[PDB]
Amino acid sequence: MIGLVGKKVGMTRIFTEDGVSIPVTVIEVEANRVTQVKDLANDGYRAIQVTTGAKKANRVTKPEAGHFAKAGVEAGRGLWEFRLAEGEEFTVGQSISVELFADVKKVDVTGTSKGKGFAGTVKRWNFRTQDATHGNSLSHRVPGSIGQNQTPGKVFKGKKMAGQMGNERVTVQSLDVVRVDAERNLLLVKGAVPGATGSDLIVKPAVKA
Amino acid sequence: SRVAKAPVVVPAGVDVKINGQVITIKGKNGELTRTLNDAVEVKHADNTLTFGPRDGYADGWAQAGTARALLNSMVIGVTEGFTKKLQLVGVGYRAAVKGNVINLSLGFSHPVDHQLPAGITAECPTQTEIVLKGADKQVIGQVAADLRAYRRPEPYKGKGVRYADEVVRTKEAKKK
Amino acid sequence: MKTFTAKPETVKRDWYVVDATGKTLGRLATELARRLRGKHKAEYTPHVDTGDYIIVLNADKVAVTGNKRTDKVYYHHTGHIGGIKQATFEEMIARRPERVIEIAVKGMLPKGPLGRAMFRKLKVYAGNEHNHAAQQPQVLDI
Amino acid sequence: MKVRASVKKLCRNCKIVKRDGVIRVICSAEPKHKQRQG
RNA sequence: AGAGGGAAACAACCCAGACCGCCAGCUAAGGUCCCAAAGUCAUGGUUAAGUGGGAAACGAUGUGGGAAGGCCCAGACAGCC
RNA sequence: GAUGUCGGCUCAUCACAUCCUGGGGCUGAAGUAGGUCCCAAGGGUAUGGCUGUUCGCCAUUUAAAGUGGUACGCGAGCUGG
RNA sequence: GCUGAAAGCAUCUAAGCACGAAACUUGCCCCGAGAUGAGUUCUCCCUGACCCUUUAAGGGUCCUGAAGGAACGUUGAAGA
Ligand SMILES: [Mg+2]
Ligand SMILES: [Mg+2]
Ligand SMILES: [Mg+2]
Ligand SMILES: [Mg+2]
Ligand SMILES: [Mg+2]
Ligand SMILES: [Mg+2]
Ligand SMILES: [Mg+2]
Ligand SMILES: [Mg+2]
Ligand SMILES: [Mg+2]
Numbered sequence: 001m002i003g004l005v006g007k008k009v010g011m012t013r014i015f016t017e018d019g020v021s022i023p024v025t026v027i028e029v030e031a032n033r034v035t036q037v038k039d040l041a042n043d044g045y046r047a048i049q050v051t052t053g054a055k056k057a058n059r060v061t062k063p064e065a066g067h068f069a070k071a072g073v074e075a076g077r078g079l080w081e082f083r084l085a086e087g088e089e090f091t092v093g094q095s096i097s098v099e100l101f102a103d104v105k106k107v108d109v110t111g112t113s114k115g116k117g118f119a120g121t122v123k124r125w126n127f128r129t130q131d132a133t134h135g136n137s138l139s140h141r142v143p144g145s146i147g148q149n150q151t152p153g154k155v156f157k158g159k160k161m162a163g164q165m166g167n168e169r170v171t172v173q174s175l176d177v178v179r180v181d182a183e184r185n186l187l188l189v190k191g192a193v194p195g196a197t198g199s200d201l202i203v204k205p206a207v208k209a
Numbered sequence: 210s211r212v213a214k215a216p217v218v219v220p221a222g223v224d225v226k227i228n229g230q231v232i233t234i235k236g237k238n239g240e241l242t243r244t245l246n247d248a249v250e251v252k253h254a255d256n257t258l259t260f261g262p263r264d265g266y267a268d269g270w271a272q273a274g275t276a277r278a279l280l281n282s283m284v285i286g287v288t289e290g291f292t293k294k295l296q297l298v299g300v301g302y303r304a305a306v307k308g309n310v311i312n313l314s315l316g317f318s319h320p321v322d323h324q325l326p327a328g329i330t331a332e333c334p335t336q337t338e339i340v341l342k343g344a345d346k347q348v349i350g351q352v353a354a355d356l357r358a359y360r361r362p363e364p365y366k367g368k369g370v371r372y373a374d375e376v377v378r379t380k381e382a383k384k385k
Numbered sequence: 386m387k388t389f390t391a392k393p394e395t396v397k398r399d400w401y402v403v404d405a406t407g408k409t410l411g412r413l414a415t416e417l418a419r420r421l422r423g424k425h426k427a428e429y430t431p432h433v434d435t436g437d438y439i440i441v442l443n444a445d446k447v448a449v450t451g452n453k454r455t456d457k458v459y460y461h462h463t464g465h466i467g468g469i470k471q472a473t474f475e476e477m478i479a480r481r482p483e484r485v486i487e488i489a490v491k492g493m494l495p496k497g498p499l500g501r502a503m504f505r506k507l508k509v510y511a512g513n514e515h516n517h518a519a520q521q522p523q524v525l526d527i
Numbered sequence: 528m529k530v531r532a533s534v535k536k537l538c539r540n541c542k543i544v545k546r547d548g549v550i551r552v553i554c555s556a557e558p559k560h561k562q563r564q565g
Numbered sequence: 566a567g568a569g570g571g572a573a574a575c576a577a578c579c580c581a582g583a584c585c586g587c588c589a590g591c592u593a594a595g596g597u598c599c600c601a602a603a604g605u606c607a608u609g610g611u612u613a614a615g616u617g618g619g620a621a622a623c624g625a626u627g628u629g630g631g632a633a634g635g636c637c638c639a640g641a642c643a644g645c646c
Numbered sequence: 647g648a649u650g651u652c653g654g655c656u657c658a659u660c661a662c663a664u665c666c667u668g669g670g671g672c673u674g675a676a677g678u679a680g681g682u683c684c685c686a687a688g689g690g691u692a693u694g695g696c697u698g699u700u701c702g703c704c705a706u707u708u709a710a711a712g713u714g715g716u717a718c719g720c721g722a723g724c725u726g727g
Numbered sequence: 728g729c730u731g732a733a734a735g736c737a738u739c740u741a742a743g744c745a746c747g748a749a750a751c752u753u754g755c756c757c758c759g760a761g762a763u764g765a766g767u768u769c770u771c772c773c774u775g776a777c778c779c780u781u782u783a784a785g786g787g788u789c790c791u792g793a794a795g796g797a798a799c800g801u802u803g804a805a806g807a
């Protein structure tokens with residue numbers, strides 16, 4: 001099934017009447033408007049392109065404005081594609097609401113994880129810290145050895161080193177749908193999802209069980 | 210050779226149709242079709258079939274002897290068909306066929322259901338017996354092997370699916 | 386009087402179609418390598434690409450002798466440690482049938498900038514149809 | 528299964544068979560006699 | 566203290582001893598499908614293992630060739646009663 | 647006219663003659679549990695006491711506490727017993 | 728394992744057919760068209776003169792400056 005594009009509102013909890021606290025992530029899912037439908041004939045694959053939210057007319061460019069005018073929808077804050085499964089039909093301009101997840105039990109949420117910047121090997125790869133005392137000289141959080149002697153004579157590709165951590169696409173799979181509030185454009189999933197408050201999220205039904 | 214040098218008499222009621230190498234045979238029990246190897250040409254005649262090694266191939270005589278035995282069973286399948294009987298040995302073991310699916314209870318925690326392939330019939334005269342009937346000798350032998358594979362006869366009490374004819378050789382558990 | 390040398394500006398190249406159906410992989414590749422390089426033209430010079438453009442159809446129908454259909458292995462290393470990948474012939478055919486002929490010919494071409502330029506004149510197609518009718522390619526019954 | 532470099536008939540019922548380029552010994556009487564060259 | 570050609574690369578192996586020049590020819594070792602100059606040469610065989618393109622004792626109804634031998638239409642060998 | 651030499655730490659990587667998990671054959675395989683061989687390298691594969699120790703012994707775990715290569719991997723990374 | 732000759736039998740194999748493992752190829756996640764073999768789709772923008780010369784993927788002057796971009800500023804759960 002296709003998914004929806006929402007916004008991470010934040011985290012809260014839902015008390016069940018039998019005394020269980022469920023940590024939930026509130027996802028604001030406004031109406032996703034279909035802006036383009038791709039088919040095998042013209043594009044070689046079946047998919048829809050949706051937009052969501054609103055955008056000030058002074059910030060949309062003429063190339064983007066003409067794309068939205070072609071579909072007859074108001075300009076959103078971005079465009080996202082969803083591969084169509086066999087049997088799903090959508091028309092351009094059609095609006096898709098959060099009630100699509102009315103009977104969906106588990107979802108996969110995709111977002112951009114929070115950026116940690118340049119991270120050391122201790123933080124990024126869970127390397128073990130060397131001794132803090134016992135003679136250690138300037139080598140407390142350094143990665144240690146990075147290879148073998150002359151026989152390889154090089155560092156292997158994919159070696160775990162310090163570098164940029166976070167600020168990348170991350171998918172969390174099989175999150176229980178706690179509540180679908182159609183009239184308020186809310187979707188409550190159990191657990192935590194990638195990204196900071198206010199970031200865009202892509203919510204699809206769970207590809208696994 | 211010695212098998213290929215014995216012509217196969219095709220009786221009345223059944224017909225043959227040679228189309229280059231692909232051969233087909235119709236009869237009362239059904240119809241069969243089979244492509245023969247390029248190393249052998251089959252010569253049609255009066256109601257008897259002759260196989261010989263086609264020149265240009267060294268293994269013709271070995272390949273010819275197979276086609277002889279192949280269609281010799283093809284003509285038997287379209288007239289008499291083939292039958293194989295399995296007998297279940299062991300308490301609780303009982304089979305029952307409904308439609309083209311066997312319902313075996315071989316002591317597993319789950320029911321095992323084997324789907325018959327198109328062209329093979331089955332029936333259970335009793336709970337601990339199953340008889341299969343069909344035209345193709347190879348396919349009826351394959352199905353019997355699969356049912357036997359669900360619970361192969363163990364060598365201590367003979368329990369499991371076995372062929373009604375074959376003899377299982379048991380052995381005792383050495384004490385002490 | 387110096388020996389004649391072909392000039393890249395004045396060399397003419399023809400277009401050809403080859404049906405790889407049933408052809409032996411190697412004995413077809415050598416004939417392609419000759420014509421891609423231009424060894425069949427009297428104006429052949431080593432440092433100039435005087436070859437022809439060749440279109441190969443039905444690349445998935447190419448034939449091999451012996452047990453090579455299941456035993457010929459194509460190795461390649463991804464550059465990552467332990468990244469030695471392999472694929473037999475018939476799965477190369479099932480996945481990327483054009484790669485089989487392209488790999489065979491690539492090994493028979495010279496190595497270097499000119500060799501890579503000759504390889505660009507080879508258009509391999511898995512199916513029977515090609516969209517180079519505008520080039521009017523001549524049937525090469527090889 | 529005995530996997531050895533020298534396979535031989537161990538009784539009257541042992542039969543030598545070559546399957547897929549591997550010399551094997553199959554015995555309809557003694558399962559201990561089952562061998563394969565390797 | 567010896568270049569050249571061959572042996573993929575390879576002082577000591579194989580061919581062969583560089584006075585200089587040539588956009589001439591014939592050969593040696595070694596080669597002649599493509600990389601890469603020259604036979605997708607001819608005739609008759611063998612191999613199916615990519616053997617060729619690494620290895621022993623030993624094992625094996627792989628297969629080719631050869632010379633004999635036992636038994637056999639007084640019915641042998643195999644199968645079946 | 648210098649290739650820093652044991653062990654530890656950190657970080658590894660490959661081989662398979664496999665320690666666990668997976669698939670099998672045989673068993674002097676009733677079951678449970680084993681023995682042995684074949685296939686299999688995807689992942690996994692202890693913490694302490696003593697000793698500079700590798701190792702080993704011991705205690706207690708674990709599905710298991712694999713064997714080796716890598717300048718007896720790794721001092722322009724640490725340590726210096 | 729099935730069928731089955733070579734080898735009147737037998738035989739999982741030689742022709743043919745079926746099973747079969749955390750290995751293999753997929754399936755899951757991420758990167759990814761500098762994939763120079765540089766791909767595809769959608770949308771947007773630009774519709775003036777004139778001279779020279781060896782006359783062509785030529786040079787020059789005047790007019791024109793779009794879509795968009797960059798810069799600058801306020802900044803960010805983005806960041807050396
Ligand atoms: Mg940040
Ligand atoms: Mg520590
Ligand atoms: Mg110091
Ligand atoms: Mg190197
Ligand atoms: Mg040389
Ligand atoms: Mg001299
Ligand atoms: Mg000459
Ligand atoms: Mg040549
Ligand atoms: Mg010839």
Ligand SMILES: [Mg+2]
Pocket residue numbers: 618
């Ligand atoms: Mg070899």
Ligand SMILES: [Mg+2]
Pocket residue numbers: none
């Ligand atoms: Mg020095």
Ligand SMILES: [Mg+2]
Pocket residue numbers: none
């Ligand atoms: Mg190691």
Ligand SMILES: [Mg+2]
Pocket residue numbers: 662
């Ligand atoms: Mg092994």
Ligand SMILES: [Mg+2]
Pocket residue numbers: none
């Ligand atoms: Mg895998």
Ligand SMILES: [Mg+2]
Pocket residue numbers: none
């Ligand atoms: Mg060391």
Ligand SMILES: [Mg+2]
Pocket residue numbers: none
């Ligand atoms: Mg060092």
Ligand SMILES: [Mg+2]
Pocket residue numbers: none
């Ligand atoms: Mg000291």
